[PDB]
């Protein structure tokens, strides 16, 4: 059953990939080679072209992503050659550097060796390569609550955070054959952060908020033609609402709205005053302003939705079915102000794609 799943996935992917690349005459021979390789070895190896296009198709098929217009410009880094933890560490450091690009963010993915017998070669524990730690002991909350379990796992392994609200978690990953993951502190020179100030309200800086420049999702599995790349971190630039309406605003995250209301000088006493809504807007304006002032790429939800509309038009013009998850595509503030809110999307899963996988901690 294993090889049959692999072979069927391979046939579907190679045919579609080669058609899109205008190389459909080469399909027959390539499938033969692959078929022999699966018979002999129990698997097959993607060409660099297949791997690059596969990762791009996977992005294009990500139902929950509003940023898909730019799928074809994804920068794909092939690191299937790595064998050592130093090599993995340095590849992750490099990804941060090249993706960051002095603030002019380049959407990038680094692809590590795939699973063999469902046996991972490299297992990345971080949710994002750059993220803040979280602590909760004896009623006291510090940092990012979403990071509490990973922070506790790291501290079990001999790491210790300074217990600020913005401790950078170390990189943490496990090599095949090793029992424990290793961890490495992020060099601060690699990590761009943005202090959050407001264009009009000077007191906003009193909140001492900041966020990191580049979201680099590092715990999802890239599946391409039946091959499981469980370790394949990828990044774009942020949409402002992710930081302002979710990370800094959620009650189970940094929960800053009452403090925002206070610095912008409005009461936070009555639901009918819509003080949470007003606070959300000002916090979200501050996030966009601050990133722009620092020269770090960011997109607002209105521009992003206009871009996604173009993606929809491009999909139809190319004869491709569009898939999407309405519940994730709508922004968390003013969704009815975007065209997304006013149409529906087929939530079918198409491969190649990025998938969730179980956390090795927890």
Ligand X SMILES: Cc1cc(N)nc(COc2cccc(CNCCc3cccc(F)c3)c2)c1
The dihedrals phi and psi of 311, each to the nearest 5 degrees, come to -55, -45
Shortest separation between residue 67's beta carbon and ligand H4B, angstroms: 11
Is residue 254 at the binding interface for ligand X, with CB under 6 A as the rule? no
Is residue 339 at the binding interface for ligand H4B, with CB under 6 A as the rule? no
- Token match 């004896």: residue? 138
Annotated binding-site residues for heme read 65
d(CA 126, CA 357): 12
Catalytic one of 68, 79, 131, 174: 68
Would you give the binding string for ligand HEM spanning residues 62-81, x where CB under 6 A is met?
Answer: x-xxxx--x---x-------
d(CA 197, CA 200): 9
Shortest separation between residue 7's beta carbon and ligand HEM, angstroms: 26
Is residue 347 at the binding interface for its own copies, with CB under 8 A as the rule? no
User: Which residues within the stretch 229-248 sit at the binding site for its own copies (CB under 8 A)?
Assistant: 245-246
- For residue 246, what are its two tokens? 């979710």
Q: What angle do CA 182, 188, 189 make, to 5 degrees?
A: 120
Residue 165 vs 325, nearer CB to ligand H4B? 325
Compute the radius of gyration of the chain from its Cα atoms. Answer: 22
**String of b and e for 84-121 (b: at least 16 CB within 10 Å)?**
ebeebbebbbebbeebbeebebbbbbbbbbbbeeeebb
Q: Is 17 labeled as catalytic in the residue annotation?
A: no
Catalytic one of 30, 60, 65, 123: 65
Catalytic one of 141, 242, 312, 326: 242
Is residue 10 at the binding interface for ligand HEM, with CB under 6 A as the rule? no
User: Which residues within the stretch 188-217 sit at the binding site for ligand X (CB under 6 A)?
Assistant: 215, 217
DSSP 8-state code for residue 248: T
**What is the phi-psi region of residue 123: left when phi exceeds 0, alpha when psi lies from -120 to 50, beta otherwise?**
beta
**Pair type for strands 238-239 and 353-355:** unpaired
Residue 64 vs 293, nearer CB to ligand HEM? 64
Shortest separation between residue 64's beta carbon and ligand H4B, angstroms: 6
Residue 192 vs 261, nearer CB to Cl ion? 192
Q: Which of 101, 149, 205, 278 binds its own copies (CB under 8 A)?
A: 278
CB atoms within 10 A of CB 132: 24
Residue 14 vs 330, nearer CB to ligand HEM? 330
Q: Is 65 labeled as catalytic in the residue annotation?
A: yes
| Residues pairing with 235 in the sheet | 108, 216
Shortest separation between residue 310's beta carbon and ligand X, angstroms: 17
Shortest separation between residue 288's beta carbon and Cl ion, angstroms: 15
d(CA 261, CA 282): 9
Residue 22: burial class (beta carbons within 10 Å; 0-12, 13-18, 19+): exposed
Is residue 347 at the binding interface for ligand H4B, with CB under 6 A as the rule? no
Nearby residues of 128 by Cβ (< 8 Å), 6 or more positions away? 215, 216, 217, 218
Is residue 361 at the binding interface for ligand HEM, with CB under 6 A as the rule? no
Would you give the binding string for ligand X spanning residues 324-343, x where CB under 6 A is met?
Answer: --------------------
Residue 103 vs 335, nearer CB to ligand H4B? 335
| Residues pairing with 77 in the sheet | 110
d(CA 306, CA 302): 6
Residue numbers at the binding site for its own copies (CB under 8 A): 245-246, 249-250, 257, 271-274, 276-278, 280-281, 284-285, 288-289, 292, 300, 302-303, 306, 326-327, 330, 332-337, 341
Active site residues: 65, 68, 237, 242
Residue numbers at the binding site for ligand H4B (CB under 6 A): 327-328, 341-344
Residue numbers at the binding site for Cl ion (CB under 5 A): 215
Residue numbers at the binding site for ligand X (CB under 6 A): 215, 217, 234-236, 238-239, 242
């Amino acid at each position: 059953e294993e090889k049959e799943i692999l072979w069927n996935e391979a046939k579907a992917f190679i045919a579609a990939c080669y058609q899109e690349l205008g190389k459909a005459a080469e399909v027959k021979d390539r499938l033969a080679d692959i078929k022999s390789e699966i018979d002999l070895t129990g698997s097959y190896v993607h060409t660099k072209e297949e791997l690059e296009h596969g990762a791009k198709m996977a992005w294009r098929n990500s139902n929950r992503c509003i940023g898909r217009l730019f799928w074809n410009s994804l920068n794909v880094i092939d690191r299937r050659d790595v064998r050592t933890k130093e090599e993995v560490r340095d590849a992750l450091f490099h990804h941060i550097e090249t993706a960051t690009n002095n603030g002019k963010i380049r959407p990038t993915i680094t692809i590590f060796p795939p699973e063999e017998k469902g046996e991972k070669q490299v297992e990345i524990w971080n949710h994002q390569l750059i993220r803040y730690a979280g602590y909760e002991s004896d009623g006291e909350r510090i940092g990012d609550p979403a990071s509490c379990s990973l922070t506790a796992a790291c501290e079990e392994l001999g790491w210790r955070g300074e217990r600020t609200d913005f401790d950078l978690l170390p990189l943490i990953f496990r090599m095949k054959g090793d029992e424990q993951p290793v961890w490495y502190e992020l060099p601060r020179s690699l990590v761009i952060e943005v202090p959050i100030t407001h264009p009009d309200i000077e007191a906003f800086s009193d909140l001492e908020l900041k966020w990191y420049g580049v979201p680099i999702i590092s715990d999802m599995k890239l599946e391409v033609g039946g091959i499981h790349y469980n370790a394949a971190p990828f990044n774009g630039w942020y949409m402002g609402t992710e930081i302002g309406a979710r990370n800094l605003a959620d009650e189970k995250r940094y929960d800053k709205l009452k403090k925002v209301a206070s610095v912008i000088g409005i009461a936070a006493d009555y639901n009918t005053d819509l003080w949470k809504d007003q606070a959300l807007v000002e916090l979200n304006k501050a996030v966009l302003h601050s990133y722009k002032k620092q020269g770090v790429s960011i997109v607002d939800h209105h521009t992003a939705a206009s871009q996604f509309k173009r993606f929809e038009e491009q999909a139809e013009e190319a004869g491709r079915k569009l898939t999407g998850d309405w519940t994730w595509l709508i922004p968390p503030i003013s969704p009815a102000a975007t065209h997304i809110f006013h149409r529906s999307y087929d939530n079918s899963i198409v491969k190649p794609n990025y998938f969730y996988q179980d956390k090795p901690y927890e």
